[PDB]
Amino acid sequence: ATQGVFTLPANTRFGVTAFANSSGTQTVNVLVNNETAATFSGQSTNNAVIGTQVLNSGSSGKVQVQVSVNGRPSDLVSAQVILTNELNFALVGSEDGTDNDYNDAVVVINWPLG
């Protein structure tokens, strides 16, 4: 299935934060309504934050996370979880290699903010 695509409430601010756990330099693209809205990059094998940003989901609410490592799209896994019918998490893992730890770039989207 398609992974890393979420429908957020439209016109709503959300946080997006990426962590890296790989020898490879990760490039994380966040698209809103099919256009790049943020790009994070970095390298860590200790879960360093490689980017955090507040964005607006715009008129469509469509947010997509893509991850590339040495010119190849990583395989993505994702889900959205809602706690107490209010607090939302859209979660992405990604695999750039063969070990299937799926943590090479980890992306957390959260809303509402404020």
Partner: peptide
């Protein structure tokens, strides 16, 4: 890194 990375490319 290293091994597993190269084998994945060659296959």
């Amino acid at each position: 890194k290293x091994x597993x990375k190269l084998l994945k490319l060659l296959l």
